């Protein structure tokens, strides 16, 4: 580092930020946040586990899936709303649990996320971190609409007292569901943080069990989503104990490196749910690496009831507050609407597997290392040139 | 978004552009064009939809196909002519439609392509854009030969009167086919272009988003002109088109300018044609192909899988934009020569002889995404090294 | 080939080397070492055979394997201890043998690794090189714990007297196994090393090129020590070894320092073990594995495929070369911690629970060589772009 | 470019060339030749057809093949000699037809290649280009040994006169075989040449046929090798008309781009020759991309009776004359001898397929294009650092 070059920082965000309606991608947010946040706000957001392969593979795995679009379909009118978890929602995506948004947005934090999510026309669901820089309550009333649905993610404590008080507290406060993170019994090693800063907590119980969940069902009517599943064998398990849904997630490539990409697990497990009757029973959400509407459409096409994005909404918020979060919402809505149209379908229910080319899902390759010498002495062809005067 | 750079640019167009006979390949026009077109002519020509993957993948797919050349064949004499949509043509490729050719050739635009195509000993079909700078009237009158063939690319307006008028107008003017574009109900989001200026908006009256199979069936009744459905991205819609009895189809994703993650047309081609035999609709429907074609060996692969002809857009745009009409001819010339030589070395002498027995198709589906690599392992790794030369 | 650079270097060793507690991962020792070892200590440690592909591929192969973690498991308590060659050890990894440790730790060499291993709360087996700077006498006397275990890496001399003497000497000194290296009949050609100085020569008396199965069978008679054949590169020779009844085998290609295009040991492991069941030689032979292991998740994959333990060379070399003995301990410590955390998140609590049901093996064989790409297509292609920040 | 910077050139080759016994690879030759030859000597040597994919793929395809080496084998003694085409040879490799060696070696040319090939202990066969800068005769007596075998490659002319005189001429002059190039009916487009320089000949007949070959059998007793085959279907054909051998070759990636790699064709066709009895009948040689002994061993392992290298021997010769050519010979001999030893076999006849891992021969991949934006804003992990004073 922190270094009177948070003076160079304050230059950048000062007006030098381009007009919010010059932002095109979710990547644009990320570039801008990369240059401006404090070294440690940035480390904490961008960071992944160890060598960061899963964090990246989460994204790249969408690129193993292509489209077989229908043409000569009337797409004048398209509708991207659907139902997640009792409520009915405007988009098929949501903000996912990011902890500690005061590092990026100092004054307003995850209040400004709630503003963003129903301050404009489109109304998006919001997961709230158990490590929120704000209180659940602070957030929920910063909301500009009773129509905007909210969701609580929960680290069950080792004091089954404290976490019983929280479930009763959040019920009383509006939230229409409970998202129980289970992929962080030990917090993952994020070395970008450490290098600059120069793994069991009690906040998060590693004792957590299936039986402990079965019990969380009884103590509440709120729908329950085991957020952090990483194989088919445990989706089936969540069905077998009839929880509401499940997020296919690996905590944003932040827990176990070489966890697979949710999109690839998704594609494995939805066929297995039809082959066991369990289709209807479980909502199957999906996060990680999602940065474009075509990603969101691949997920939905495969079976996802809804798809979460974390870091992007941090980065937008971190840069442009609640307004950032909305533009980012609209950005993604427009991406989804156009690609649907070009896909040749008009509702989320028509987003099926027969729209996807899945022939190369499994082409997750590692090439043999480059012949250094052969390639150093090779000279490629050259483009024709121009001249003199 | 241009900046008395016009002089930096004009200075290169200026005699710095090398002689036309110094152009070896199609990639040269593309380079010359990148340095001399106006910032937004370049963005509009060069760009594709969103992250731009289909656009690139259209080309690279050609490279998952290899050859099984026949040796010891009398390849003295080679005929690259074939037939498209009922005309006989000199060449098994065509100039796909490309809107706004004045951005890069302000004086003559599409008229100069029409001359490039019909002027030389080798002449090539020209599809004309519905949203071309010039009039069809102007572009057709511009043609140097009666024998040269020009097709019409149609966007059906949502005011089907305007459209009925247009079709009537262009069959009167003597165009030989209608390429109705179906891959743009919403206009693709090309971000290099947007990044310069600074959802119902990317819909518009001028290209009807409700165009349907039933429409094309009616289009077919209202005209004697052969109809080609341009913009098909899956085998399912080639069959649908064989069923309404239309003359043909372009497997195409609009040069990667509409839907990202549309497959490479060559890939759709290769799965499509076998099915077109399995249901004996083989020669009931001419299947064209476009996107990412830049070499004559590219063309050969598509012909060997069964395409009736293969289209090119940006390369003719870039050639026309640096060298106007003799640019266009040079590219025809360059690509023609590529097809001829590669045909000899492939071991065939005609277009009808270009069949699948010549392709090695085994690695066609090796569309890979590698696992992200190990920035740290590679960071500290030091590679071998060449020997040196001493000191002085 | 060193050049009063020794000061440039000494200046970094100098207090510029960061505190040991600032080392996060094994790649850090490797970097620090690259800047501070003497030009030819670095070439001898870092180098591999010829174009160096196996050496790199040993690592990257680990990355064609992914995990199927078990969730909602009581992972409060985790035991990373297992058993090797009849001893019980704290940890499922070991320090493979590495010759000439004084090049990088001139004062103490192998003795410092022996202390790094036996000194802390967590202690780790040490294989000792036949061609180590120090004496076995010296390295064994250097050990901090009775409980710590040290193995002997044997090259059989072509004068089998010298060898008979050696084996006798080291069982007297209390080593717990003999790792006879069979992957160096000719010594691999490491060109970074050769490039500094400026076929019967790369053969030598000191490592007998005629070593045979019949020899190892006799070696086994002459000693009570468990024997491990170190350097096996195919399943066929694991079976041959189960047949002469030897205690075990290291699937290994010598850290990529002998034969280029030897397969990744993890790959040989994964095909080998299933066969070791199919012929019920499952627990008749302990299969170790080495090369390219740098993360605790690397170790886990090998354990999950059935390896009895997994070895590391260069990383302990580099750690010992920057930080001597507390370097070594830190790496043990670092790698141990990696294995523990990754075990929790994998959903298991012991080494016996690490089985194949946890690995995703489907893309294990996607060892690709991509087609050379299109320098010209990519040359003129311009990629999308991020938005900007204004001016001041 | 040609430009009184052939003055910078003459600097380099002047003594600045490292001692010939500081050369380790065939690549080292290539680097040195890259810096020294005239722009056009270099263009003409390095050049490939069009985009140069086949030229490169020729090499890289060896890297799809790995080894399953035998250990605990007595390899004290190894023997790499074998028989090619009547004669018995010291190595299993040979120099292949490179045309025009006076561009690189001005005074001595392909005479210095013949010196190189039997001037030292090991004695390697030499193909002589029909476009040799020297006469067949000039070369053959520049040879320092009657033991060193020679070979003539032949462009049949359209004047079946001129080429009938040549076959009778070369017979009379020693050459133990005839190599009929058939992959250049039209000369391939080499754009590196053209760019600096700013496709039917009669020298080379495109009328050439199978029947024309059948006839070349009768007019000579010299063994005949149809050099330039690129599919299995034509190896079979060469057998069917009982010619002696055949080179699996695509003229060094200089004729048809997207011709396959000879090593991959080799592996396809040798099984097909056993499955049709034709194993014994045909010698199957192999060139392209061969730069290391491990390449040469993969070929042999698969069935190759012998493996040709072109450009490397040009580059060595171009730099160090006949002495260059020998060192390059010995370099490759030592590579072959060591890797055999480490392979655990002692004669060329024991080099079989069971030594090779062929499971990924067919992993000739094209990856999907890189996500430019995602990768631009990504920041990798970073190595720990060092400090201050
Ligand atoms: C900065 C940071 C903090 C996070 N904190 C939590 C948390 O407390 N609980 C949780 O379940 N997920 C947490 N996540 C993960 C997400 O809810 C989500 O699973 C992840 O961000 C999805 O990946 P993405 O960022 O690529 O979209 C966090 C993610 C980030 C990047
Ligand atoms: C600048 C630009 C304008 C285009 N305009 C049209 C158009 O108006 N109508 C149409 O049907 N296709 C249009 N296309 C698509 C092409 O006809 C063609 O499918 C594309 O150029 C094929 O890709 P390529 O540029 O890789 O060869 C356009 C393409 C470009 C690049
Ligand atoms: C500098 C160096 C010296 C080695 N010396 C020996 C040796 O004397 N004997 C032996 O059996 N292995 C020796 N090895 C091989 C290792 O024991 C081990 O197999 C290798 O280090 C595993 O690869 P890694 O460095 O990727 O972990 C040596 C390796 C290195 C890098
Ligand atoms: C400079 C140059 C000239 C060549 N001239 C001929 C020729 O006249 N006839 C022929 O059959 N091959 C000719 N070749 C090809 C070779 O004999 C051989 O097939 C090729 O060089 C093998 O590939 P490599 O250089 O990668 O080893 C030539 C190759 C080069 C590089
Ligand atoms: O940052 C995180 O990934 C996270 O999940 C978390 C959980 C609890 C407290 C702080 C952060
Ligand atoms: O730019 C284009 O790709 C295009 O086809 C088009 C279509 C209609 C209007 C403008 C451009
Ligand atoms: O350097 C080596 O890899 C090695 O193992 C060794 C073996 C014998 C002598 C010297 C080094
Ligand atoms: O250079 C060549 O590839 C070649 O084969 C050749 C053939 C005849 C004359 C000159 C060159």
């Amino acid at each position: 580092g922190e270094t009177k070059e948070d003076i160079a920082r304050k230059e950048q965000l000062k007006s030098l930020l381009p007009p919010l309606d010059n932002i095109i991608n979710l990547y644009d947010f990320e570039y801008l946040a990369s240059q401006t946040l404090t070294k440690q706000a940035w480390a904490y957001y961008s960071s992944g586990a160890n060598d960061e392969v899963t964090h990246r593979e989460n994204h790249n795995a969408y690129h193993r899936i292509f489209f077989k679009p229908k043409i000569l379909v009337d797409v004048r009118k398209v509708d991207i709303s659907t139902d997640m978890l009792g409520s009915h929602v405007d988009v098929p995506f949501y903000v996912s649990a990011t902890a500690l948004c005061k590092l990026g947005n100092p004054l307003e934090g995850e209040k400004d996320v709630a503003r963003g999510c129903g301050q404009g026309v489109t109304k998006v669901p919001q997961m709230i971190s158990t490590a929120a820089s704000c209180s659940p309550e602070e957030i929920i009333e910063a909301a500009p609409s009773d129509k905007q649905i909210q969701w609580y993610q929960l680290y069950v404590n080792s004091d089954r007292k404290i976490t019983d008080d929280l479930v009763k507290n959040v019920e009383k406060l509006g939230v229409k569901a409970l998202f129980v993170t289970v992929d962080a019994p030990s917090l993952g090693q994020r070395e970008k943080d450490m290098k600059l800063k120069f793994a069991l907590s009690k906040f998060i119980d590693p004792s957590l069990t299936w039986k402990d969940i079965e019990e969380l069902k009884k103590k509440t009517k709120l729908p329950i989503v085991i957020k952090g599943v990483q194989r088919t064998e445990d989706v089936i398990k969540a069905a077998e104990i009839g929880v509401s849904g499940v997020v296919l997630s690996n905590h944003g490539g932040r827990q176990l490196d070489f966890s697979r990409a949710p999109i690839e697990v998704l594609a494995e497990t939805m066929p297995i749910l039809e082959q066991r009757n369990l289709k209807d029973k479980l909502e199957v959400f999906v996060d990680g690496g999602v940065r474009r509407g075509t990603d969101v459409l691949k997920a939905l096409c495969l079976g996802a009831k809804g798809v979460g994005l974390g870091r992007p909404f941090l980065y937008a918020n971190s840069c442009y507050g609640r307004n950032g979060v909305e533009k980012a919402i609209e950005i993604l809505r427009d991406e989804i609407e156009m690609s649907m149209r070009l896909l040749g379908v008009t509702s989320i229910a028509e987003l099926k597997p027969d729209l996807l080319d899945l022939s190369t899902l499994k082409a997750r390759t590692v090439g043999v290392p480059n012949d250094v010498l052969y390639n150093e002495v090779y000279e490629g062809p050259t483009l024709t040139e121009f001249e003199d005067a």
Side-chain angles (χ1 to χ4, degrees), chain A residues 1-387 389:
Chain A
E2 0 229 323
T3 299
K4 44 146 254 327
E5 46 69 34
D6 61 345
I7 288 309
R9 252 81 169 260
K10 291 297 280 175
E11 256 263 76
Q12 312 284 349
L13 50 165
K14 140 251 192 59
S15 277
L16 281 193
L17 278 238
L20 216 257
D21 47 48
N22 289 197
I23 302 299
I24 309 150
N25 323 300
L26 266 28
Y27 297 116
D28 281 343
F29 286 130
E30 190 181 333
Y31 166 51
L32 269 16
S34 79
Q35 262 12 238
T36 66
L37 323 189
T38 65
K39 275 154 157 36
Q40 85 112 169
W42 174 240
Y44 177 68
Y45 288 163
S46 18
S47 259
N50 302 110
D51 283 337
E52 306 199 335
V53 342
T54 288
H55 170 76
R56 292 171 294 168
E57 167 66 15
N58 273 1
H59 175 66
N60 300 146
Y62 283 95
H63 289 15
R64 300 193 189 90
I65 301 173
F66 273 72
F67 294 125
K68 302 159 111 230
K70 306 181 206 247
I71 55 83
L72 283 174
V73 161
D74 177 353
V75 289
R76 203 223 32 275
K77 228 208 183 105
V78 117
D79 182 46
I80 72 166
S81 62
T82 201
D83 95 79
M84 298 160 201
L85 232 38
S87 286
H88 162 291
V89 283
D90 279 340
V91 295
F93 67 85
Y94 63 82
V95 182
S96 193
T98 337
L100 264 266
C101 326
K102 273 200 228 250
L103 291 171
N105 197 344
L107 353 170
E108 308 311 327
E110 40 272 277
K111 267 191 279 92
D112 259 16
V113 179
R115 273 140 217 193
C117 280
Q119 88 161 203
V121 173
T122 285
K123 266 116 229 319
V124 192
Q126 154 156 234
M127 199 125 116
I128 303 174
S129 213
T130 274
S133 267
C134 293
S135 53
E137 31 267 287
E138 265 226 283
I139 271 148
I140 271 157
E141 84 195 20
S145 137
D146 282 27
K147 251 168 290 84
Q148 92 200 242
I149 155 157
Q150 257 135 136
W151 279 338
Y152 201 71
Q153 92 77 204
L154 200 82
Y155 286 116
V156 347
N157 212 104
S158 338
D159 216 343
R160 269 21 143 49
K161 222 272 289 1
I162 320 238
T163 264
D164 223 301
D165 296 321
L166 238 69
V167 169
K168 296 193 217 259
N169 187 244
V170 299
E171 229 161 346
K172 221 166 259 257
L173 273 154
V175 318
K176 312 256 186 93
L178 254 215
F179 273 91
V180 187
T181 302
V182 298
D183 58 21
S186 153
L187 258 33
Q189 180 153 277
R190 295 177 302 87
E191 324 198 335
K192 280 162 155 145
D193 262 75
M194 299 168 64
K195 154 138 210 221
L196 152 157
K197 206 184 233 78
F198 293 124
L200 305 177
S201 243
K202 206 175 240 93
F203 285 95
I204 312 162
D205 206 21
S207 74
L208 238 210
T209 317
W210 281 115
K211 268 272 212 66
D212 294 292
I213 286 307
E214 306 200 84
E215 213 73 9
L216 185 56
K217 282 213 69 115
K218 288 150 224 245
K219 311 174 137 278
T220 212
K221 210 191 114 294
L222 282 183
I224 252 139
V225 171
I226 300 162
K227 175 206 163 149
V229 175
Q230 305 164 69
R231 3 106 76 178
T232 298
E233 291 82 353
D234 290 340
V235 166
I236 281 167
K237 264 175 231 289
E240 260 157 35
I241 75 159
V243 287
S244 299
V246 99
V247 187
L248 257 33
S249 160
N250 51 52
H251 213 93
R254 285 159 79 82
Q255 292 306 287
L256 210 218
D257 217 13
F258 293 102
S259 179
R260 298 180 280 172
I263 192 62
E264 155 169 353
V265 161
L266 224 200
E268 170 169 45
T269 112
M270 299 311 246
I272 289 292
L273 293 193
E274 271 161 16
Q275 213 179 204
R276 275 147 175 265
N277 299 128
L278 314 188
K279 177 41 215 238
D280 239 300
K281 321 291 120 93
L282 245 185
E283 280 169 25
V284 193
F285 308 84
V286 139
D287 70 16
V290 176
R291 303 291 188 267
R292 292 261 195 197
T294 45
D295 301 337
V296 181
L297 297 187
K298 319 215 167 133
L300 295 176
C301 273
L302 272 186
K305 192 102 223 135
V307 358
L309 297 72
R311 285 191 199 74
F313 292 121
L314 268 183
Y315 295 137
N317 184 42
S318 264
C319 255
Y320 291 101
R322 63 220 157 81
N323 281 352
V325 183
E326 176 204 74
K327 166 64 142 164
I329 280 156
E330 22 205 71
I331 275 178
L332 192 61
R333 190 213 34 240
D334 291 357
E335 287 191 1
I336 294 169
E337 227 159 73
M338 160 160 287
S339 286
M340 249 187 86
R341 244 158 195 129
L342 272 24
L343 247 190
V345 287
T346 43
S347 62
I348 309 300
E350 302 145 51
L351 290 162
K352 303 186 180 101
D354 90 310
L355 261 43
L356 290 190
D357 167 350
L358 304 155
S359 57
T360 73
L361 235 194
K362 234 64 195 26
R364 179 179 62 210
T365 47
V366 176
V368 343
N370 288 119
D371 192 329
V372 169
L373 286 172
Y374 185 102
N375 290 164
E376 223 164 79
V377 286
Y378 178 72
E379 326 215 318
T382 319
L383 293 156
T384 211
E385 249 184 289
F386 283 125
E387 261 143 347

